[PDB]
Design a protein around this ligand. Structure first.
Ligand SMILES: [Mg+2]
Ligand SMILES: [Mg+2]
Ligand SMILES: [Mg+2]
Ligand SMILES: [Mg+2]
Ligand SMILES: [Mg+2]
Ligand SMILES: [Mg+2]
Ligand SMILES: [Mg+2]
Ligand SMILES: [Mg+2]
Ligand SMILES: [Mg+2]
Ligand SMILES: [Mg+2]
Ligand SMILES: [Mg+2]
Ligand SMILES: [Mg+2]
Lengths: 169, 294, 21, 159
RNA sequence: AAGCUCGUAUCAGUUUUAUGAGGUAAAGCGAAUGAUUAGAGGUUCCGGGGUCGAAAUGACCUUGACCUAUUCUCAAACUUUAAAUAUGUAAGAAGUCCUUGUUACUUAAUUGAACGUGGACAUUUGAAUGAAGAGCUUUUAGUGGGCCAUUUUUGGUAAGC
RNA sequence: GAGAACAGAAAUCUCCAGUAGAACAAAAGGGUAAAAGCCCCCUUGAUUUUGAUUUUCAGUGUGAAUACAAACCAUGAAAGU
RNA sequence: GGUUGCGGCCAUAUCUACCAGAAAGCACCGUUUCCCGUCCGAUCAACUGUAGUUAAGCUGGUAAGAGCCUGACCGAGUAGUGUAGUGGGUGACCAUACGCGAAACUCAGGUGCUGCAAUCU
């Protein structure tokens, strides 16, 4: 039936792939903590490509995870920017999804020219409760087949709440 | 389609033993535990194992043999009502109580209880059960925490303190007990004594009760129902300790039924296997119906 | 590479590729 | 040029098994070894410490020493025109009782019990074993089993 | 060569019984690695294209790839499996059982360990066959270019290599 | 494999599959999955005293290695190492 | 018989897709003052056992299921091989005598057992 299989948000991950190290990386870092109330983390580049101008381990991007009520309200504050209007092919085949935006100042931080103007990529991890089965240490196990998330489940949920719409396909 | 693993893969798969599949026992731990100095031929190594399940605590004394492991004695949490404890059967003090119980139980059944009395005037101090002069050189046993993660003040080490204060000689340092100062290497005996006697809940009563009555109601509801005051909490633990030191004899339950009755009910209740003749008839019928043009 | 992979608008690539002052 | 290391030409000898890699089941360490036990040697490639040299692969000897985690063994090696006794030190992993004695003692105890119970009536217990005696005379009937006649087979290519 | 200590044995280029170890012969590739011929079915938001098209995450053919099930053939430095022949150990008195002495070792513990005291069990005392005696010590001559035959086998076309 | 702005065959993030098809200084071969792999914390047992044993072997040496003994240590809660 | 803790043997115990599961137990499950760790009480820490649910985990069954295990005069006394001849053949190689003896293949059957301790309509 449907006693407690209710879908819910795990985590909002906030990503910025600023292509270079140094000051503009530092400023990128100084963007998120205001938005997140939370300190960010920096990821290194794991092999040179020499066309994007990157070396091994020269620390390119910044991303954060947020969960719970603060995560859902910030999600809402992003979907307001995107006017509740998302394309089907954005959705993961597992039931995850995500999108991107530009001009982070179009929400929250006014301009603060010392910081600059940056775009982000939000990505949402979605599931049902009872998920710690795959995450605890003792007696680790996988989730049942019927109990996973799906394209259809997540799009239907996204329909019914936020009363939003999905595009062409 | 995608969720399809090849026949070759299935036929070359290795399997973990059984407990690794179940994610239950760390054989790398069991290695360092159960091996005996080969010069000491049959003298078995004894493990005080501790396990924390939801709403219950288990502690046991085990030696190991080829045909299986064998247990000297066991101590569950859920019989502490026999010793005057009715709530919070998973708190760190509950673990201490269980350790004390198992300690005195084993010593009583082994005939060591008169000697190695243990410690009565508990003070949160760190000391080992030293060997009595020219005596029987007290019993020795080592921890077995399983996969449970070690960390400062973890409630398993309450069981360690229970065994130690009971009198078992259990080799251990103290730098993980709650209140082990970190930036400087000392221990706060009185804070430890607080966690022994339920400080973290006795104190926690006050802020919540003077702060948030509905929250103080939903949890600790049983405390209100059975009329326990915060200050009195230390008293019941102290009285328990004497109750254990009085009688650890492990009265077992009476089961109000029979082994056979339980087996019969579950047997008649359970679903059964299907036999080969019926399997053949089943496939034949499936042919004659679905394949047989319905 | 695809046949039409990044093919821009004439009036949108002017603010895309200028690469010098 | 030529080459003779400590572990040369062991590439197959020391491979573990098929489908048996990984840690070792505890029974091996749960064994207990007394001085005077007769023991076989089979190397175990998983534990590089205290291995036996390839020459002592598959051999059999008598234990003579016991230490915290290993065993002293005596082997007789044929070098030149004599035998020399070598003493080995092996971790308990490459070691297992040769149940030859395990069964032999069974025979001995059963033998003594048989001797005693036979002496209880003085009836010449007759201890020694015998090789396979030639089988005895016997009669074969044909009831419902009439002899069946064969014949050699002709030839064809069978393809 | 000189002997020495003893007199049917603590033996044996041997078989049997019991129990180990091995990766060669063989075999396998619709089993890992690697090689290899052929069609068959799908699959391109994705290869190269052409045809219909202004393009389309539009259609048709083509080539290629990729995947699926099949098919033909191989390995000294591949392998699931796995021989015969060769090979380790045991088949008793230096044994087995019973009782209880010693220790600074070890055990929670007279528990264990090791060595003993004392007692019990003989020619069927622990498979086969043989045993021309068995065991032990010195000391010193010659020798340190080899060759051939069956079988296994390496380089080379081969050779009386 | 499936998704996320610039971002594309390749940057960063997330999920699913994953018996090792990777890594382990170097040649190859063994061995390794709550590790022998990757990351983090503490340290110097890469110490002292001389023996015993294995490999090449004359049962010499050298090299390398193994198992104890007697101290002082490091680590871990601990067994251990 | 069910369940839990500790196991032995390490797939007859794994994998793929479905279906059922009383009681208890296990579990998911609620909270962040304190010990404690995190980019984030997700993991780990602590407290309650109170607010709920067997949906999942787990157990069992189901499949002319993959796999896996066992057996067989199924293949085969074949392949291979120890020993012998003044045996055959120019040779490559092959029969013969006394011996040992595979794998693939085919068919049939099977799909965890079990020790210690506690608890369960
Ligand atoms: Mg560990
Ligand atoms: Mg082998
Ligand atoms: Mg070879
Ligand atoms: Mg061949
Ligand atoms: Mg083959
Ligand atoms: Mg191959
Ligand atoms: Mg042999
Ligand atoms: Mg001379
Ligand atoms: Mg010469
Ligand atoms: Mg580790
Ligand atoms: Mg040497
Ligand atoms: Mg001849």
């Amino acid at each position: 039936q449907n006693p407690m299989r209710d879908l819910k948000i795990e985590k909002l991950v906030l990503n910025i792939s600023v292509g270079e190290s140094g000051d503009r990386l530092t400023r990128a870092s100084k963007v998120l903590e205001q938005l997140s109330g939370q300190t960010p983390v920096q990821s290194k580049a794991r092999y040179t490509v020499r066309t994007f101008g990157i070396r091994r381990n020269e620390k390119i991007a910044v991303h954060v995870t947020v969960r719970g009520p603060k995560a859902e309200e910030i999600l809402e504050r992003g979907l307001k920017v995107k006017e509740y209007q998302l394309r089907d092919r954005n959705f993961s085949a597992t039931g995850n999804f995500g999108f991107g935006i530009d001009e982070h100042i179009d929400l929250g931080i006014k301009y603060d020219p010392s910081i600059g103007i940056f775009g982000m990529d939000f990505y949402v991890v979605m599931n049902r409760p009872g998920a710690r089965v795959t995450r605890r240490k003792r007696c680790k196990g996988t989730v049942g087949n019927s109990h996973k998330t799906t394209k259809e489940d997540t799009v239907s949920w996204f329909k019914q709440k936020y009363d939003a719409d999905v595009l062409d396909k | 389609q995608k969720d399809a693993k090849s026949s070759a893969y299935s036929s070359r798969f290795q399997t973990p033993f059984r407990r690794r599949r179940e994610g239950k026992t760390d054989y790398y731990q069991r290695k360092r535990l159960v091996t005996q100095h080969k010069a000491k031929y049959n003298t078995p190594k004894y493990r005080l194992v501790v396990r924390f399940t939801n709403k219950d605590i288990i502690c046991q004394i085990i030696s190991s043999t080829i045909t299986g492991d064998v247990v000297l004695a066991a101590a569950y949490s859920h019989e502490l009502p026999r010793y005057g404890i009715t709530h919070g059967l998973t708190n760190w003090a509950a673990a201490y109580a269980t350790g004390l119980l198992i300690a005195r139980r084993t010593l009583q059944k082994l005939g060591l209880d008169e000697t190695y009395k243990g410690v009565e005037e508990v003070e949160g101090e760190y000391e080992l059960t030293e060997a009595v002069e020219d005596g029987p050189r007290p019993f020795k046993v080592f921890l077995d925490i399983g996969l449970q993660r070690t960390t400062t003040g973890a409630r398993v080490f309450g069981a360690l303190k229970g065994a130690s204060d009971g009198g078992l000689y259990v080799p251990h340092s103290e730098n993980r007990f709650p209140g082990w100062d970190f930036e400087t290497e000392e221990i706060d005996p009185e804070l430890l004594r607080s966690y022994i006697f339920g400080g973290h809940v006795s104190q926690y009563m006050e802020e919540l009760a003077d702060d948030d009555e509905e929250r103080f109601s939903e949890l600790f509801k049983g405390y209100l129902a059975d009329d326990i005051d915060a200050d009195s909490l230390e008293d019941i633990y102290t009285s328990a300790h004497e109750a254990i030191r009085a009688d650890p004899a492990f009265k077992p339950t009476e089961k109000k039924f029979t082994k056979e009755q339980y087996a019969a009910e579950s047997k008649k209740y359970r679903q059964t296997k299907l036999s080969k003749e019926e399997r053949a008839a089943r496939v034949a019928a499936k042919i004659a119906a679905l394949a047989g043009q319905q | 590479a695809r046949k039409n992979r990044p093919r821009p608008s004439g009036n949108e690539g002017a603010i895309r590729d200028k690469t010098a002052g | 040029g030529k080459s003779h290391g400590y572990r040369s030409r062991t590439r197959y000898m020391f491979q573990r098994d098929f489908r048996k890699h990984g840690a070792v089941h505890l029974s091996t360490y749960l064994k207990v070894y007394k001085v005077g036990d007769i023991v076989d040697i089979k190397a175990n490639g998983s534990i590089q410490k205290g291995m036996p040299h390839k020459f002592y692969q598959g051999k059999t000897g008598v234990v003579y020493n016991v230490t915290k985690s290993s065993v002293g063994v005596i082997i007789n090696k044929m070098v030149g025109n004599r035998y020399l006794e070598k003493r080995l030190n092996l971790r308990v992993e490459h070691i297992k009782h040769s149940k030859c004695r395990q069964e032999f003692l069974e025979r001995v105890k059963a033998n003594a019990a048989k001797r005693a119970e036979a002496k209880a009536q003085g009836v010449a217990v007759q201890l020694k074993r015998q090789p396979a005696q030639p089988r005895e005379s016997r009669i074969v009937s044909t009831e419902g089993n009439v002899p069946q006649t064969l014949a050699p087979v002709p030839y064809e290519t069978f393809i």
